[PDB]
Design a protein around this ligand. Structure first.
Ligand SMILES: [Mg+2]
Ligand SMILES: [Mg+2]
Ligand SMILES: [Mg+2]
Ligand SMILES: [Mg+2]
Ligand SMILES: [Mg+2]
Ligand SMILES: [Mg+2]
Ligand SMILES: [Mg+2]
Ligand SMILES: [Mg+2]
Ligand SMILES: [Mg+2]
Ligand SMILES: [Zn+2]
Lengths: 199, 209, 96, 129, 81
RNA sequence: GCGCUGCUGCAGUUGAAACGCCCGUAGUUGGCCCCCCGCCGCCACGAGGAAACGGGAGCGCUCCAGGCAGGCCCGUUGGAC
RNA sequence: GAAGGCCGGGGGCUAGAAGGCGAUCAGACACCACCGUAUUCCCGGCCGUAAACGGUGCCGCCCCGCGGCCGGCGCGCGCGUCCCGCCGGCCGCCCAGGGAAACCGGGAGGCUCCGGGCUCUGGGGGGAGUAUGGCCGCAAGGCUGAAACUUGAAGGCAUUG
């Protein structure tokens, strides 16, 4: 289900606005193209995808085995807040090759699930996960290549507000699923924390 | 000193939580510790053999730098076979590395019948083929009592895999030992990935392991 | 073996092309294989353009240019540093 | 020019099944194609199919369910004797236990098991397993 | 699944079949994964612990199309609309 | 041995090897459709037509290579096919 | 059926086989400089070869994704030589797959799990595209095409120096 508050927040966040390029595997999520050429997503689809992803995430009993990777500087704050509130693990900054296959590496873990923001910017992590039976969930724009991506979340990734909002909604939904916070009352935390603030 | 696990799977093996190797193979889990297998073969039931020893040289400003490359296979004669290689400045260390690599990678082998079904399977389930370099191999099921019709190198592998009846054909430059052994290894590995009408049964996935 | 997918020339949908002469050695070359550059330069070198303009009597006169096209062969381009021998991976780069 | 319609159909089917597709469309229809597909269906390899009429060059739609591993034709129809089937079975099939070889006889299109049962021979069409 | 003359099974183990392609998953297919999905109470906001399990082979993952396959599978297994 | 003569079953960008291109006769190959009649091929069965050789049923030349013998109380003893 | 070459007629400016001459070199009858005949141009007619190359025969089917250009047609609107498609052609990158690899991927894929149809060629290296016959051609030469004898490697793609 989609409510007016959520849709208006998304539109003010410009989450539904994408890129000129289009992929044959993302046309199911495209609603229309503007006159300039930018493609427009469908909010029902992205909301359903968020719900399904939250179900998949909560299915994991130990939150410490979920890995969040984000080399994009815009996403860092959002991923930190997501892990802190959801008790997950972050790999900010450069992803060291061998972090999943080299057991001598000082930062080595055996995650059960992997989360990403941009396959192109985090290509190395996805490849490594392909070697050790690790599924992945990622955020995808209108032009993304699905190479070992299991679940995609259609949304823009350039605008930092879009990045922070999506993680905030995901955390809200998973927390509601876990049984801590009910659906009716608004979550205490506000999205503005997830959006990076300058100076 | 004592085997200290370095992986979640290794720790599970240290505990008695998982009891069979077929459980690990059923979920395609990579193996990184040589102890994870020897625990399941405490009596050193695994055999060992050095197929070939070759010397490789590298030209340098002052003469050549020589090194040794070794190939090793291991099996318990009961549907398990492994193959590995190792390179080192010294022969013994190369042999140790090759043995370790061969132990690390191992595959189960499916066996079947030629016509009449009589208790224990005695030959390969069906026709299998492999490819490495220019070499190709064909393994064709044979009747009971037909022996192993194959070259000495391939026959040793088929023995260590626990087969008794089989017809073989080789093509290409088979005098290159490593590529022949790799082709037969790949053919055997493919066995448990071929669908048959007996496996058409539709089973629901289970939440174990 | 084969070094370039284009075989060292730009020849598509044709059998033969007209020939040109290298401007340095006067070698005959196919038009699709010759190295071409376009230049635009002042008739008077820029060091004395101001002097010429001061000496000029006319008002608002503009210095004329030279418009020429230079065509060179493969050997002469390399010898005169018009092109460079590149690495195996940099041979595919097409931007200037 | 087009000659063997069955070969094209089988190649298309295998190509589609390779990449885990769900439906295929083969352009020219024929009685032999229909009987081949019926036998495949009775043995459990390709489930259901439909024939679409257009007056010329009827099209067909088939639904796939994996299972099939290989299919082919033998272009020149050789005349297999009734007692010469074992050699072809060994040469063509992976094992003597689950493959099928198709023959055309005066009694109709059947399998090699059925022809062995009736101790008759005929001409070969193709194979699948 | 291959029986003996007496009807006693003799295969050492039965491997897993990809939920979308019905293809056997090999002992060395390290790109093969299986996920799970949780059910939601009538009132929602609470998962019962009952899990629906799916497994996919490496080939389809490399080729893409796992997303659409998963969507159709969930639709067939659930009223996700 | 030799899938180094390739029907099963080779090769033909770079190792040996696609005629400079087009037209074209002999030759080879030719979409789909009619429910049953005639003809050709095809499959199965059968008749007819030398054995020896080969296969193969039975028989302890002391065994065997062999031969068609042989036992008493023998298919009408046998040499079937 | 390129260019060169030949026969018989025209024409004669550039360049330029042969030839001549100056330099350079130990020598230089070659490279560099200068002069210059045939030829290069047109008509009529012979010859019938080229790294005549995409070194990949012709017809036909299926086949990941992204992009550019050319020709024609249709759809839509906010009417721009806009964007969304179809057919045909010329190109680039590339997942699978293939291969000894370089690489191909509008196949060099769908093939040892080895059968769509037709045609041509090859079977270690030299001797040798030679000898001897035949056909064609004014000729130069082209098509066809051996043996004796000899030899243990010759070749391909890639790696380190
Ligand atoms: Mg070179
Ligand atoms: Mg040309
Ligand atoms: Mg050969
Ligand atoms: Mg050459
Ligand atoms: Mg050659
Ligand atoms: Mg001329
Ligand atoms: Mg040629
Ligand atoms: Mg073949
Ligand atoms: Mg020779
Ligand atoms: Zn020049």
């Amino acid at each position: 289900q989609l409510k007016e508050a959520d849709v208006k927040k998304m539109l003010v966040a410009t989450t539904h606005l994408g890129v000129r390029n289009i992929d044959r595997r993302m046309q199911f999520y495209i609603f229309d193209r503007q006159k300039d050429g930018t493609f427009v997503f469908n909010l029902q689809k992205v909301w359903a995808k968020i719900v399904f992803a939250a179900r998949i995430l909560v299915t994991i009993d130990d939150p410490a085995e979920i890995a969040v990777v984000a080399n994009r500087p815009d996403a860092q704050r959002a991923i930190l807040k997501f892990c802190k509130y959801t008790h997950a693990t972050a790999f900010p900054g450069r992803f060291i090759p061998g972090n999943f296959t080299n057991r001598m590496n000082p930062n080595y873990c055996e995650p059960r699930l992997l989360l990403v923001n941009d396959p192109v910017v985090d290509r190395q992590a996805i490849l490594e996960a392909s070697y050790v039976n690790i599924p992945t969930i990622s955020l995808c724009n209108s032009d993304a290549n699905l190479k070992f991506i299991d679940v995609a979340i259609p949304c823009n990734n350039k605008t930092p507000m879009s990045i922070g909002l999506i993680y905030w909604l995901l955390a809200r939904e998973v927390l509601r699923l876990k049984g801590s916070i009910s659906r009716t009352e608004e979550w205490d935390v506000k999205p503005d924390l997830f959006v990076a603030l300058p100076e | 000193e004592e085997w200290h696990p370095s992986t979640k799977l290794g720790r599970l093996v240290k505990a008695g939580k998982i009891e069979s190797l077929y459980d690990i193979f059923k979920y395609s889990l990579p193996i990184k510790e040589t102890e994870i297998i020897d625990y399941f073969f405490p009596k050193s039931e695994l055999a060992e053999e050095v197929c070939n020893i070759m010397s490789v040289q590298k030209q340098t400003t002052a003469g050549q730098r020589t090194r040794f490359r070794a190939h090793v296979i291991v099996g318990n004669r009961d549907g398990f076979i492994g193959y590995g290689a190792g390179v080192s400045k010294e022969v013994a260390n190369a042999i140790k590395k090759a043995a370790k690599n061969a132990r690390l990678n191992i595959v189960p082998v499916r066996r079947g019948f030629w016509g009449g079904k009589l208790g224990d399977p005695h030959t390969v389930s069906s026709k299998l083929s492999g490819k490495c370099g220019s070499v190709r191999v064909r393994l064709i099921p044979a009747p009971r009592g037909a022996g192993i019709v194959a070259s000495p190198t391939v026959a040793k592998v088929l023995e260590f895999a626990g087969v008794s009846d089989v017809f073989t054909r080789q093509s290409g430059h088979s005098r290159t030992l490593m590529n022949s052994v790799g082709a037969v290894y790949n053919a055997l590995k493919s066995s448990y990935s071929i669908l048959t009408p007996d496996l058409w049964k539709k089973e629901q996935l289970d939440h174990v392991q | 073996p084969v070094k370039r997918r284009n075989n060292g020339r730009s020849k598509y949908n044709c059998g033969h092309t007209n020939i040109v002469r290298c401007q340095n050695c006067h070698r005959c070359v196919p038009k699709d294989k010759v190295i071409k550059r376009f230049t635009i330069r002042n008739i008077v070198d820029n060091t004395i353009a101001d002097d010429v303009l001061n000496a000029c009597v006319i008002q608002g006169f503009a210095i004329p240019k030279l418009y020429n096209k230079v065509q060179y062969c493969v050997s002469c381009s390399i010898h005169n540093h018009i092109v460079r021998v590149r690495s195996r991976e940099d041979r595919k780069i097409r931007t200037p | 020019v087009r000659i063997n319609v069955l070969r094209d159909a089988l190649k298309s089917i295998c190509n589609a099944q390779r990449i885990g597709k769900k439906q295929v469309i083969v352009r020219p229809s024929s009685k032999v194609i229909i009987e081949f597909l019926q036998l495949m269906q009775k043995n459990g390899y390709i489930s259901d199919f439909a024939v679409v009429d257009n007056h010329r060059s009827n099209r067909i739609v088939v639904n796939l369910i994996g299972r099939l591993n290989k299919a082919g034709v033998i272009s020149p129809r050789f005349d297999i004797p009734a007692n010469d089937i074992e050699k072809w079975v060994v040469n063509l099939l992976p094992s003597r236990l689950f493959g099928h070889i198709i023959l055309t006889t005066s009694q109709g299109i059947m399998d090699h098991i059925e022809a062995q049962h009736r101790q008759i021979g005929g001409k070969v069409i193709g194979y699948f397993y | 699944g291959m029986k003996n003359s007496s009807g006693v099974v003799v295969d050492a183990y039965i491997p897993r079949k990809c939920s979308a392609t019905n293809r056997l998953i090999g002992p060395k297919d390290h790109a093969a994964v299986q996920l799970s999905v949780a059910r939601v109470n009538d009132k929602g906001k609470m998962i019962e612990n009952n899990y629906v399990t799916f497994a996919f082979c490496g080939a389809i993952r490399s080729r893409g199309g796992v997303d659409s396959a998963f969507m159709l599978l969930a639709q067939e297994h659930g009223l996700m609309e």
